[PDB]
Amino acid sequence: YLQEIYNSNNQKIVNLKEKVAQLEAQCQEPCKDTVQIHDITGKDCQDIANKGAKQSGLYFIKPLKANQQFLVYCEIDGSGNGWTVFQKRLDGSVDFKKNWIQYKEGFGHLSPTGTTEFWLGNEKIHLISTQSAIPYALRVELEDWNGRTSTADYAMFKVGPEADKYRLTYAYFAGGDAGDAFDGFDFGDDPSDKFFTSHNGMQFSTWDNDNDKFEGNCAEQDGSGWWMNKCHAGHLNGVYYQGGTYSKASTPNGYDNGIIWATWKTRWYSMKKTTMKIIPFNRLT
Amino acid sequence: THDSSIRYLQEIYNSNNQKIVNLKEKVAQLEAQCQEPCKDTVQIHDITGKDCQDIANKGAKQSGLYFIKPLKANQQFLVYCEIDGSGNGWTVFQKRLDGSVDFKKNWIQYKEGFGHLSPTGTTEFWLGNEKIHLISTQSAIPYALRVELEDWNGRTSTADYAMFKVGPEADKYRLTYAYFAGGDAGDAFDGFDFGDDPSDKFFTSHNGMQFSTWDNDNDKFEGNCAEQDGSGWWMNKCHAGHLNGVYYQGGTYSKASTPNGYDNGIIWATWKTRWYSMKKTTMKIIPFNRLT
Amino acid sequence: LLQKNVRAQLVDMKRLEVDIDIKIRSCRGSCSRALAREVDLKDYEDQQKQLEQV
Amino acid sequence: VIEKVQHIQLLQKNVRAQLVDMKRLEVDIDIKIRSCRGSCSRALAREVDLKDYEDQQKQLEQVIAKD
Amino acid sequence: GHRP
Amino acid sequence: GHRP
Amino acid sequence: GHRP
Amino acid sequence: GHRP
Amino acid sequence: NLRVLRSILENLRSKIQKLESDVSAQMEYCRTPCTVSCNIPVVSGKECEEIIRKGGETSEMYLIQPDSSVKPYRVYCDMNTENGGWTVIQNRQDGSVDFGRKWDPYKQGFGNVATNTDGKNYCGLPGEYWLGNDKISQLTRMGPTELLIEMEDWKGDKVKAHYGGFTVQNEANKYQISVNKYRGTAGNALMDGASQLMGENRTMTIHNGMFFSTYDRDNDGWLTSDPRKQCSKEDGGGWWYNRCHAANPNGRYYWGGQYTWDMAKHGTDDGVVWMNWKGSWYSMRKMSMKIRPFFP
Amino acid sequence: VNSNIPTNLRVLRSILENLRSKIQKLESDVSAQMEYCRTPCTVSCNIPVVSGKECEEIIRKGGETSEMYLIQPDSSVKPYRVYCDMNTENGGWTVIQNRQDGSVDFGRKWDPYKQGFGNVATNTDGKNYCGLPGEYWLGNDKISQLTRMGPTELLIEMEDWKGDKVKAHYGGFTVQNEANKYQISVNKYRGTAGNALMDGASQLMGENRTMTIHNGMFFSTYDRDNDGWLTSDPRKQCSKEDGGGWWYNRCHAANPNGRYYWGGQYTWDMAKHGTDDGVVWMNWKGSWYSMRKMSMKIRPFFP
Ligand SMILES: [Ca+2]
Ligand SMILES: [Ca+2]
Ligand SMILES: [Ca+2]
Ligand SMILES: [Ca+2]
Ligand SMILES: [Ca+2]
Ligand SMILES: [Ca+2]
Structure with missing residues (x-):
């Protein structure tokens, strides 16, 4: 009627302004980020497990040599071993055709679920592997397109300083069903084959920084960053080919440039998943 | 008369006659003393093995001559094993001491080896390349090459190389090794920056080099490094490490002394000037693990 | 007169719809999702112009 | 009374024999000694004076002509 | 691979 | 040594 | 704005 | 030599 | 005659419903939070x-x-x-x-x-x-x-x-x-203050050299005593307010950009404003x- | 008259005096060698x-x-x-x-x-x-x-x-x-x-030659008779008389393992058994010559 409906909605207002306030309170916190970094730190992933870490995830570390901490992905098993993963492949998400700097500082993404591709920097790998007298072991996990997996361990795995172009060194092949590709492969014909495809003692190479034992540029030709020697027998930072199998037709320069491990599969077969990780030798046996 | 005389003669007749029979007896006794030949100081021990280390594992406690037969070999062969108190069995394949042996040998001689083996290790030699091959590659177990050098002042140094391997004849016994395991003598196998031209260090490194002889040029030089320096070595537009070089007395020498006008002595650029030739030299191997 | 009190009502009202329009949007960055809505401020304008004549 | 005829013609025949057994002996020895050079620390150097023998054996046949 |  |  |  |  | 005001209040009575509804709806949406995986x-x-x-x-x-x-x-x-x-x-x-x-x-x-x-x-x-x-x-x-x-x-x-x-x-x-x-x-709003104003009126809108002030921390160049009369509580969020502002990046996000005093919670240009460019009644997108x- | 010059037959005494001294010399030489043999000869090959x-x-x-x-x-x-x-x-x-x-x-x-x-x-x-x-x-x-x-x-x-x-x-x-x-x-x-091994000594004729052919013979040492000398007398064998071991027939035409006669030229009165036991090769220089x-x-x- 007269002054009725006016005060009707008018009385409704004050209470509404109250609902708003209550609403305002509900909208102050940002979206929850599923990614989380644990509180524990250490010389490496193993060191962390020793401190009671019971889950594979992201952690910060600072090798005795490092003067700045950095994030890494630690794979922790039930036995209590802390693996420090420095390389991982799953899908063709990341382009491993990166330059020297990128390979030095690293590229890709770190995930607590370990479901992401990356290359921790070479400089980081260096600082870790050589941070102390304690020898490290490098394990290489490979998985084909049929779910089958294999491994390969290398004792006294060490990566040299940038001054020595992050040379890959290791005392010996500690064993594994995947076979020792780091020792070269006898690809038939020419006898120099196995010799010229071995990786021990090789320096790292990128398209913009040729350090291979090839008059040409293995890295530019295969589009990757790896320890090349008149190319390779083991090539984990290679081109991700869907399905695994591929022909030289598929390839650009006409050479095998996929993720290969000659001792486990033909060079015309590229892996589905890949993992390079290290742990102090002592944990093994 | 003078019959007394005859008495004496008849007497003296039997005198020496009785002496004879006993003398023939002395001879017999003498004859017995002269049947055995002169004693040869050189002796070969009874133990055998895959290599010198393998032998030490079997209880060998002295550096000397032993026969070995690598898993690859189908015929055993003699070698000199250096065994220390720690229990390490080094298989020596090269040794220099004086200018006794001429290392200016041909391909075949470098293949089968030349020189002499001594239980005292006081002799120069080059075990055959083929033997070095069969040993170093006989198994998956990685070997380490140690190079011992001694100047003319008694001072010594060493240089270790991990994963030392010598390729087959089919690949001209290429010298390979993963990395320089360290040593105070320096890494000459990696080449040397002799100044001037930048290609120097690259063109004087030995890793991945095939062996060359005057009669079998396999160097990365338009000419013949081996014929020019008179040796057999893993040449690459020549060298920085040249252990099978010409033995110069005193150590120091000038290009004048040299024939072709180049350094051809026993050199190790990282330890001494190329115009300084070593007094003693030793190339030996042992399974890597014995160092870890 | 009373025509004066509704004029006031409109303001407190207009600003309120706006405050709300704003407060709601500020929830997009906090809650599972934010209600989509357009402010019909014209409904306000036309309604406030019809008042002016009086 | 000729006790010194057959007593001598025999004695002389007996020394002739003595010489042979002797000559061969020096030789045997000369040889056996040399064969020790290759066995003992060293071997005594010696020359066989077989001429002393020859001249002494020639002076003997010079006698054989009487009885 | 290799590079012949 | 080096060879030019 | 400023303050009048 | 020979022996008759 | 002109009692057509009914037509007004009828709308207002309905508006409140609409609003009170929208809020309770959002209240609900807020049971559960938004999420990201960075x-x-x-x-x-x-x-x-x-x-x-x-x-x-x-x-x-x-x-x-x-x-x-x-x-x-x-x-x-x-x-x-x-x-x-x-x-x-x-x-x-x-x-x-x-x-x-x-x-x-x-x-x-x-x-x-x-x-x-x-x-x-x-x-x-x-x-x-x-x-x-x-x-x-x-x-x-x-x-x-x-x-x-x-x-x-x-x-x-x-x-x-x-x-x-x-x-x-x-x-x-x-x-x-x-x-x-x-x-x-x-415009150089931070150093020169608003170009539309003159004399001391302009200078009091220079942000250069100012102190940060939130609605619970007065540090503005507005020396006064009235509590309700402060730069922040009236102009949105925290900022280096002088005798208020020439630029207000942390203002209030007015949809559409163009807004008026009868919309501002305190009758002041509290939007995401940069006076020197488009005045004070325009909030940037x-x-x-x-x-x-x-x-x- | 009767005993003309029996005293001038002392050209027999001059003999024995030398022999008596010879034995001394010899016995000395041996004992000397006996001594040298305390210690052996050595080599380092x-x-x-x-x-x-x-x-x-x-x-x-x-x-x-x-x-x-x-x-x-x-x-x-x-x-x-x-x-x-x-x-x-x-x-x-x-x-x-x-x-x-x-x-x-x-x-x-x-x-x-x-x-x-x-x-x-x-x-x-x-x-x-x-x-x-x-x-x-x-x-x-x-x-x-x-x-x-x-x-x-x-x-x-x-x-x-x-x-x-x-x-x-x-x-x-x-x-x-x-x-x-x-x-x-x-x-x-x-x-x-000469072809001593197949043809036997060239100086001999008939069956005398044929019995010195070594071809086809058996090896015989002084403690193992295998020569072509079919007999019964023990002291009468090829080896024990001609030096060392060799493929003796009815003895030899070639005797390389004979006895090392210094000087080469030697005689029967020097040979231990009166046979050519030197390092002989008849076909070239006869049987009384031992090669150097x-x-x-x-x-x-x-x-
Ligand atoms: Ca607020
Ligand atoms: Ca290159
Ligand atoms: Ca240089
Ligand atoms: Ca050449
Ligand atoms: Ca103030
Ligand atoms: Ca007989």
Whole structure:
């Protein structure tokens, strides 16, 4: 009627302004980020497990040599071993055709679920592997397109300083069903084959920084960053080919440039998943 | 008369006659003393093995001559094993001491080896390349090459190389090794920056080099490094490490002394000037693990 | 007169719809999702112009 | 009374024999000694004076002509 | 691979 | 040594 | 704005 | 030599 | 006769219903929170410039550690604009975050640094946020630092303001701001105050040299006694207010841009304003502040 | 009248005086040698890196110098020392027997000749290797086993005391095993000495010659009669009278393992049994001449 409906909605207002306030309170916190970094730190992933870490995830570390901490992905098993993963492949998400700097500082993404591709920097790998007298072991996990997996361990795995172009060194092949590709492969014909495809003692190479034992540029030709020697027998930072199998037709320069491990599969077969990780030798046996 | 005389003669007749029979007896006794030949100081021990280390594992406690037969070999062969108190069995394949042996040998001689083996290790030699091959590659177990050098002042140094391997004849016994395991003598196998031209260090490194002889040029030089320096070595537009070089007395020498006008002595650029030739030299191997 | 009190009502009202329009949007960055809505401020304008004549 | 005829013609025949057994002996020895050079620390150097023998054996046949 |  |  |  |  | 006011109140009575409904609806939507999954890029550095130098070519969320003393934090890097290497300090773009906040939140930082892309596993999209004042301060004090401020109206037009010198003090100094060496297409609102005003009226809108003030911490150049009469509580969020403002990036996100005094909660231009360009009754659609190092 | 000059027959006393003194000299020399024999002779023959089935293989493997090498003719057997001649007639020779200074007694029994005896080699002036051959006889088993690997040729060299030298080359040479009394077989002769082994002594005629042919004979030592001298008298055998072991027929035409008569020229009154027991090769210089140097070498034939 007269002054009725006016005060009707008018009385409704004050209470509404109250609902708003209550609403305002509900909208102050940002979206929850599923990614989380644990509180524990250490010389490496193993060191962390020793401190009671019971889950594979992201952690910060600072090798005795490092003067700045950095994030890494630690794979922790039930036995209590802390693996420090420095390389991982799953899908063709990341382009491993990166330059020297990128390979030095690293590229890709770190995930607590370990479901992401990356290359921790070479400089980081260096600082870790050589941070102390304690020898490290490098394990290489490979998985084909049929779910089958294999491994390969290398004792006294060490990566040299940038001054020595992050040379890959290791005392010996500690064993594994995947076979020792780091020792070269006898690809038939020419006898120099196995010799010229071995990786021990090789320096790292990128398209913009040729350090291979090839008059040409293995890295530019295969589009990757790896320890090349008149190319390779083991090539984990290679081109991700869907399905695994591929022909030289598929390839650009006409050479095998996929993720290969000659001792486990033909060079015309590229892996589905890949993992390079290290742990102090002592944990093994 | 003078019959007394005859008495004496008849007497003296039997005198020496009785002496004879006993003398023939002395001879017999003498004859017995002269049947055995002169004693040869050189002796070969009874133990055998895959290599010198393998032998030490079997209880060998002295550096000397032993026969070995690598898993690859189908015929055993003699070698000199250096065994220390720690229990390490080094298989020596090269040794220099004086200018006794001429290392200016041909391909075949470098293949089968030349020189002499001594239980005292006081002799120069080059075990055959083929033997070095069969040993170093006989198994998956990685070997380490140690190079011992001694100047003319008694001072010594060493240089270790991990994963030392010598390729087959089919690949001209290429010298390979993963990395320089360290040593105070320096890494000459990696080449040397002799100044001037930048290609120097690259063109004087030995890793991945095939062996060359005057009669079998396999160097990365338009000419013949081996014929020019008179040796057999893993040449690459020549060298920085040249252990099978010409033995110069005193150590120091000038290009004048040299024939072709180049350094051809026993050199190790990282330890001494190329115009300084070593007094003693030793190339030996042992399974890597014995160092870890 | 009373025509004066509704004029006031409109303001407190207009600003309120706006405050709300704003407060709601500020929830997009906090809650599972934010209600989509357009402010019909014209409904306000036309309604406030019809008042002016009086 | 000729006790010194057959007593001598025999004695002389007996020394002739003595010489042979002797000559061969020096030789045997000369040889056996040399064969020790290759066995003992060293071997005594010696020359066989077989001429002393020859001249002494020639002076003997010079006698054989009487009885 | 290799590079012949 | 080096060879030019 | 400023303050009048 | 020979022996008759 | 003119009792057509019924027609008015009938609408108001209904409006309240509508509103009260919308709120309770949002109240519900707020039972559950929004979520993101920002997987961290392998590369890190002291800040974005370092990162881009280290090979970080894509604009996205990075982890930066300006000082080993401090703990590494997430931040959005702009690697495309003007040679890239920018560290986003503030960002407004959709009104999804409340900038009208208190002292601590502005000190600690607030909002959403970044969000996931269409169908990607990384947060390559910046969110509306304000990097903490402490963080911002500490950054401008490492060495010389430049400031880039970009804004975009609702018509699509955009201008910028570049200050070659930018420094923010610590909490103790009430985060006093200092800028210099301007150049751009917007106006030098920070140093010269609003171009529309004259005399002392203009000067009282200069932000250069001002102190940061939130609605629970008066530090403005408005010396008075009336509590309700302050720059912040009337003009949106926290800012280096003088006798108020010429620029108000942390204002209130008015949709549509054009707004009026009868819309403002206190009858003041409290929007995301930059007077020198489009006056005080226009709130930008996009507003941001990015910083980067130097040499001297 | 009766006893003319029996006193001037003291040209018999002058004799015995010398003999009495001779014995002294001799007995002294022996005892002296007896002493020298307290201590033995020594050598230090450092072994060459290269080895092979035999000398020919070795020289093929690059062994250019004549010296002592270690050869292993069969993996069954153990590697043994031997002296290689890499200079004579294209080199590649394996020394089987060597005579050169009379430093080794070749008058030995069955086993020593079977096992081998003497000094293979000795050190040079001031060298650390045995580059000089010694007087020796490689064992009969070794010799046999070698001639049976395949076709084998034989080279026999001799040198008189005047410096002259001749040779005898048999293109076929084979020695049987112990069971077959190491029966010898040679053929395809050529040389400057005579074919003593196949034709017997050239000085003799008729059956007298034929009984000195060594070809086809059996080896016989003084403690193992296997000669072509069918008889019953024990003291009357070829070996015990003619020096050492050899393939004696009704004795010999060639006696390399004879007795080392110094000077070469010798006589029956010097021989221990009155027979030509020296290092003789009748076909060249008769039976009363012992060579200064005599050697036997073997090498594989054409294949
Ligand atoms: Ca190259
Ligand atoms: Ca140089
Ligand atoms: Ca050449
Ligand atoms: Ca608020
Ligand atoms: Ca104030
Ligand atoms: Ca008989």
